[PDB]
Design a protein around this ligand. Structure first.
Ligand SMILES: Nc1ncnc2c1ncn2[C@@H]1O[C@H](CSCC[C@H](N)C(=O)O)[C@@H](O)[C@H]1O
Ligand SMILES: Nc1ncnc2c1ncn2[C@@H]1O[C@H](CSCC[C@H](N)C(=O)O)[C@@H](O)[C@H]1O
Ligand SMILES: Nc1ncnc2c1ncn2[C@@H]1O[C@H](CSCC[C@H](N)C(=O)O)[C@@H](O)[C@H]1O
Ligand SMILES: Nc1ncnc2c1ncn2[C@@H]1O[C@H](CSCC[C@H](N)C(=O)O)[C@@H](O)[C@H]1O
Ligand SMILES: Nc1ncnc2c1ncn2[C@@H]1O[C@H](CSCC[C@H](N)C(=O)O)[C@@H](O)[C@H]1O
Ligand SMILES: Nc1ncnc2c1ncn2[C@@H]1O[C@H](CSCC[C@H](N)C(=O)O)[C@@H](O)[C@H]1O
Ligand SMILES: Nc1ncnc2c1ncn2[C@@H]1O[C@H](CSCC[C@H](N)C(=O)O)[C@@H](O)[C@H]1O
Lengths: 251, 251, 251, 251, 251, 251, 251
């Protein structure tokens, strides 16, 4: 296998990324103004991810239910949703944001996922004790929400989605899922979650995938073709971006 | 169970409510002008409910049939509908408003309902002889409707909806249901009412829930997933408001 | 001489008002729940007013600036605006609501105003100390706004608008007027104020009149025709309602 | 029972109707000008019926086939369609108007039809010889049609629709039905006619009902639910009018 | 001088009119059912007139102000408007209907008016005391209006419009004109009224002419060209009908 | 059976037709300019047919495939199509126009076709040698088409469609049918051709009938009801015209 | 000067025209059926001219007034208009069709018209006595109009437009011009008529030119630029066709 056939950063993207890291970490901005100037360090690729999440969220503002992410890593998307929920929904204490991850990286891989060299147990592990920090970040956002006095509006569920997702659902019979964001990369957990969330979607719910047509991670495609079929609903892109691919339930 | 995980009033929301109550009861406004200045005392949260009811009503203006509320309490919504019916349909004597309730609170609760501390029989009980008072309120509105001379345009049906709803439908084979507003909280009566009203709905009829995705009251969701499925039709919010969740039958 | 040629309440309308008044003041609803059930006592005519204000507010949600009402009486419209502002603009602390009145009724009437038997000095006077009460009412609402910590978001200006409006404007050079609601009834103050607010309107600003084509109060029409002409912009009704008459500046 | 729960004329509506009747029959208008000033005597309620037939007619101008009314009485609607056909379709000699009736009133009633005190044999009977008069009225209209030389564009079919409708259809195999207006009030004949006309409807054909949700006449509702179901197509009102309820075949 | 170049009735139109006149005045329909069956006698030409007036009325439903007709004769249009005001605006007691006429025919004529042989003083005169009968007819309609207790909602002003229209305006300074219907036929009075009404129109008000391009009555055209110019606004027809021609002020 | 109940020419339509014919054959127009002034001799009824053909054709400009007429006679529609194909599709040599006919009138007739007097064998026959002449007419048109070097873009298929249509289809397996125009009048061949063309239609293809609801030729209706059902797709008129009736395949 | 740089018939276009002429004059079609089969002989170029006239007429269906063609020749467009008026406006006897021509060719050419070899006096002359034949053709159409009893609905005005157009307008003060079709080719008359018709156009009136940007006839352009300017209104093509160029008055 030629590693260059997989999507990877150009020398230029790496340099931009490194330079911005340096300028953030060695900034002459007074410390208490840094969080007021973050777009200085938010480059095209990452800006694009933010704008995509906003696009997805704007499509479920008239749909009841919660937002769910499978595959959280450091929580980039969860931070986005928490901010976006403040922007769009000050008066919606029921828009719960729920993140699922082992927080210890890939639990185990299936043969179908072994395409490139990063398909191994432990990949994307974040540091020990990470969830408590991420929760602390989320709580910092919620502190100034109109419904900040209501708790469990952000929830991190730690462990294998194959177990945690059905358990979460059993414990929350009130669930409707407005937006389901799949970023697991792996075939087995994707398939299992797709199956479990099905009774809690309504027509109009968004199902989104981070890696559906990526050669390095065919698992999500394989899972989709198995549980539903690629033409079960219309899979769409936000024009100009390879990801996410997303569908509107019932369409 | 942490009670703060359930939606509850902020201290400032309580304060607003309490101050407005006091300013309503101790007012330099002549008593004869109070009903000409009610918005002085109608805070955001309740104004929102009024706007929501108006929004749902406007969606059934071209749909034949009647308006039904399952779960009335003091009758806030019934009064709204009566006023709105005047605004929109002076020439429609067949737009009957029917409110079902025990008027003695929750008759009995199912296991699935006991998530929180208010899940007891008698909860939301209104005083003795309340239905007659509400009838007087409704009559007072209708007294100046264009079709005020026609009776039973507002009907209060006392008792368990498990029997009163099939009984009302039986006594009224002419029924078409334009708007079904569900506020029963409990699994059992919701399921029963859903099943009973189904043959009286047309494509375009609105079925609306007050608590579809509230952790405190999962019985409406459980009932929905049992009788119909969350994706039977597109469930929707009016953007910015946790509730009602509503669907357009047949969509 | 024929007073029936002026709009007045039918016997039934009078009946509705008195009855609902009686039912409000002698309600079995626990006193602390009354402000949660105000629609019971909100009749068609008043509901219509509320819906109209909402319709006007919605037309300026993408227009910067403040809301001004000229002629407040007990503050029916100010309460409405204050609640709607919570509904629509939790994050807009610049949307100031400004009500102008003598609060002692008509200060001095012109001959053109003297069409009916109620065009007298001091007509619509409210009790001494009223502005402080109304301010308490508005403070009560603002208590639980997202930006409740910011003061002077509701301002009552007491005096003859012929002097107080130009003074307010001179004191607030940041002013842009999104919504100007005219409810003074009288020719001279309407003329004066129409002239003064003009440099503070943008294309898209709404100017509304409560009695533009009412035989009993021709002053607003007379003022309009003299200052701008009736075809300066398109004057509109919300269909089904004799009032308000409103125009979008620049259309 | 209490008859006042049934839709009935107000004292004022009765007054309007009697006054207009007297003003028509005892008028200073020259006799040859009466038919040029009919709207003087056409009150809101009957104007509404006319505007409704017009709205229904306009929806089938792009649909091939004939117009049928079941339940003609004096022929109010037949006169309307004959005029409207002139307005919109000078060049369509195939737009046949067919009216069915006993012209001797209700032939017999089912038990479900006996809610009110008018549900007996002979009800709504028209005098002997009436059909021949009604044909005179129709012929009079057609005399000035562009296709006035083509006979049988208006047809009165006398008898019980249970027999006459299928008979008419068998004798007319070219039939397409663009508009079917149901005004029989009773259950069994509505049911029979519904089942009969089905093979002659196209998608877009209008099926309309005068009494679908009237408590006094539940037969049409019962028939509809028995034959098709209330959610077979979207049943609709023209906004602000209790009747007719109509559907677009295939929607 | 060919009279067949003027629009006149065909033999068939004449026959239809005569027959319907006979069938109306010699009807076997019970006297109390006549005004429930008037469309039996309303032929194409007149039905067309009715639908045209309805079309114009619908275009001013969101325009404040009154309806004026200049040239009333027997009042066909006034009756139409009275019914239509009921259909569309039960809650607008300010929609005054004002009809201007000598009620004794053409007061005098101009030479430009003398194209055909019906341009003589007294043409279209109605019997003595006619305004009292027409007022009785209008009062009959209003008797059952929601705002029936408000008087002078219909006004017949007798005299030459050249003086009566400016006098009406001077006495009613609250006037906005939503719909102005010119049916005077003659140049001079049309000219004078067009000039008088102008300060009372808003953008969106409708001005309609019954005979704008009629070779028999060039008066309205000459007047229009003199006062405004034919391209002052877009003059329009309702497709398929020679009259009325109308414009939306300001367009 | 009254023959006046079938559509037939009025005396005036006959007169117009006979006059135009005489004016054509006895024209002072120079012979070589006649084909530049044909609209002089094209009356309303025939102009309408042309506009209808153009309307149907415009609906299939984005649909692949050929144009078929069943029932050609002298070739009126084939000539229209040839010219229209020039107007809209100079660059489409695959838009073949195929006309089927015996060219000897009806080959037989069924009992259901025998409603009128002209339902006999050989009705609508054209002279011996006629197809060769018609072919000469079409070749003249194609001579100046952009793709006039490609042959068989117009094809006359002589014989009974019961045999020739399936034979044509077997010989042309590339066939898609964009527009199928039925003008056979008769039950049996309509039925046969309807079944045969089905596999060659796409969603969007237009099926059109010239006689669908004509009492004199109920065969096409009988065929439709038997093969597809009148509600298989929406049958449509071009407003104002009794015919064609046409449907969009798959709607 | 190269005459090839002017638009002219290709050999194939010439061949088509001559063949069709031959086939029309030696046709086996029974003489009485010729006028039922004209599209056989209507080639693309001529079909195109008909569809454009139809497109133009369709755009003035809601505009009052008459249709004028300046430059009639053999009357092709007038025939088209007569028939289209039948298709679209059976009920509009005021839609006068007025054609102006010398009927003896170009009266005299300006120097700016002498670009090609056909720019000479007498060019396009029609036989002596032609107008009576054309009128007889027009009368033939009108014979079967709904308003056929109204005369002068077609007018041929013989003479020089510089004199006849102003005379016609002076004699017809009721004139509104819905559609003005310029086909004079020459500068002087085009300028004169443009100036003359202006006071009779309304906003929406269509002004169309047959030779606006034709090198061989620059006279219409020169006149447009002198009288109004090319950017007075938006000049438009029906896409695909070099002519007509048309504008919508007031756009
Ligand atoms: N079976 C499973 N259960 C829980 N998490 C899983 C899982 N399989 C994969 N994951 C998680 O999916 C994540 C993929 S990385 C996703 C986050 C993304 N990089 C962002 O910044 O937005 C990893 O953290 C991995 O631990
Ligand atoms: N089985 C049952 N039959 C009748 N009423 C029931 C019921 N189960 C619950 N309810 C009622 O549901 C109500 C919920 S409180 C909802 C009312 C609220 N004020 C509003 O505006 O709609 C209670 O009053 C309770 O008595
Ligand atoms: N010149 C002036 N200066 C200040 N207030 C004036 C004024 N002229 C009239 N007003 C006020 O205009 C008011 C009219 S009543 C307004 C009613 C109120 N907006 C409601 O919704 O109920 C009176 O209070 C009167 O005092
Ligand atoms: N079985 C049946 N067969 C024929 N006519 C019937 C019938 N049952 C009821 N009807 C007729 O239905 C009619 C209802 S009254 C219809 C009123 C009329 N359409 C209008 O617009 O005014 C009666 O005339 C009655 O004779
Ligand atoms: N100067 C004037 N003052 C008042 N009326 C005038 C007038 N000049 C003409 N008229 C009136 O214009 C009328 C024209 S006939 C109007 C008919 C009526 N609009 C209908 O719908 O049937 C006549 O009644 C005539 O009296
Ligand atoms: N079974 C059959 N097979 C082939 N042609 C048939 C047929 N039945 C009827 N036809 C033909 O259908 C034609 C009907 S006349 C249709 C032609 C019309 N002028 C037009 O513009 O299209 C006749 O020519 C007849 O010969
Ligand atoms: N000054 C003038 N007065 C009257 N007619 C004129 C004219 N100048 C040119 N014409 C006429 O304009 C015509 C141009 S040919 C017109 C062709 C025609 N419109 C068609 O559709 O076939 C000629 O007949 C010519 O006589």
């Amino acid at each position: 296998q030629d590693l260059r056939a997989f999507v990877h950063d150009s020398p230029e993207e790496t340099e931009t990324t490194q330079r911005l890291t340096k300028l953030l970490t060695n900034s002459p901005i007074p410390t208490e103004e840094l969080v007021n100037n973050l777009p200085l360090f938010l480059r095209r690729h990452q800006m694009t991810d933010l704008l995509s999440m906003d696009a997805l969220y704007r499509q479920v503002l008239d749909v009841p239910g919660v937002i769910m992410e499978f595959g959280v890593r450091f929580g980039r998307h969860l931070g986005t949703f928490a901010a976006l929920r403040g922007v769009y929904e000050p008066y919606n204490p029921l828009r719960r944001i729920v993140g699922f991850d082992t927080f210890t990286g890939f639990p185990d891989v299936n043969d179908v996922d072994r395409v490139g060299p990063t398909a191994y147990q432990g990949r994307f592990a974040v540091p020990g004790g990470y969830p408590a920090y991420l929760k602390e970040v989320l709580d910092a956002h919620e502190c100034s929400d109109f419904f900040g006095h209501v708790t469990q509006r952000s929830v991190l569920v730690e462990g294998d989605v194959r177990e945690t997702v059905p358990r979460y659902l059993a414990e929350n019979p009130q669930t409707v899922i407005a937006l389901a964001y799949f970023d697991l990369d792996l075939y087995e957990p994707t398939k299992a979650v797709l199956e479990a969330i099905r009774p809690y979607l309504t027509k109009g719910s968004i199902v989104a995938f981070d890696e559906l047509d990526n050669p390095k991670w065919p698992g999500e495609n394989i899972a989709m073709r198995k549980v539903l079929g690629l033409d079960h609903a219309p899979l769409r892109l936000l024009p100009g971006r390879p990801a996410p691919a997303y569908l509107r339930w019932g369409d």
